[PDB]
Design a protein around this ligand. Structure first.
Ligand SMILES: CC(C)(C)OC(=O)N[C@H](CCN[C@@H](Cc1ccccc1)C(=O)N[C@@H](CCC(=O)O)C(=O)N[C@@H](Cc1ccccc1)C(N)=O)Cc1ccccc1
Lengths: 99, 99
């Protein structure tokens, strides 16, 4: 649908059998979720943002359902304040910015 | 216009007589620009993101031109890696997310 930005653009996602709330973030190349019990294999990685760098576990080919659209992609899990849905998944649901 | 997210959503902004490139960020409540000389007064503030917290100077009623749309709002200046245009200005140009 069309979401305006007067409030934070939060959506419901279903990942790993669990329901969560996530922020649609055009300024994030990657999708980062707060600590979570994910299954499968992974590899370490570091990401940066406004205040510095954090270490996250990187899981590939993870099924995630965002506002009803299923997509499969990489998800990073670590000590992030909020769950963020980045461009790697946003392109997958054909999300665009319009003005 | 309509901007897809296969690449980072960077735009040209004009602020303080200077031209810069900034990232349209739906996941940022605020607009943060790298170090730059701005006129007018200000007050200290701290902001957080993935990574931690940074200190920025906060200037109000600043004219900024984003892809041709002039808007007046608060701008925060400090040690951010990239220039980020947050929701405080994005609502001003009537920017929406669509999918
Ligand atoms: C700028 C202010 C006003 C402080 O807001 C946020 O940080 N907002 C966060 C959105 C994040 N948007 C961008 C802003 C940005 C962009 C470039 C540079 C610095 C900052 C971001 O950090 N994006 C990260 C998200 C994590 C990720 O994508 O993996 C990113 O794309 N980082 C890249 C680019 C990068 C590399 C090195 C250093 C810094 C950044 C990366 N691959 O690590 C959301 C949030 C909500 C609640 C609490 C805290 C934070």
């Amino acid at each position: 649908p069309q979401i305006t930005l007067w409030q934070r653009p939060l959506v419901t996602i279903k990942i790993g059998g669990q329901l969560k709330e996530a922020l649609l973030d055009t300024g994030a190349d990657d999708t980062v979720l707060e600590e979570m019990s994910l299954p499968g294999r992974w590899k370490p990685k570091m990401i940066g943002g406004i205040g510095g760098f954090i270490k996250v576990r990187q899981y590939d080919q993870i099924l995630i359902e965002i506002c009803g659209h299923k997509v499969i992609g990489t998800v990073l899990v670590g000590p992030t304040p909020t769950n963020v849905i980045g461009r790697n998944l946003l392109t997958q649901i054909g999300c665009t910015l319009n003005f």
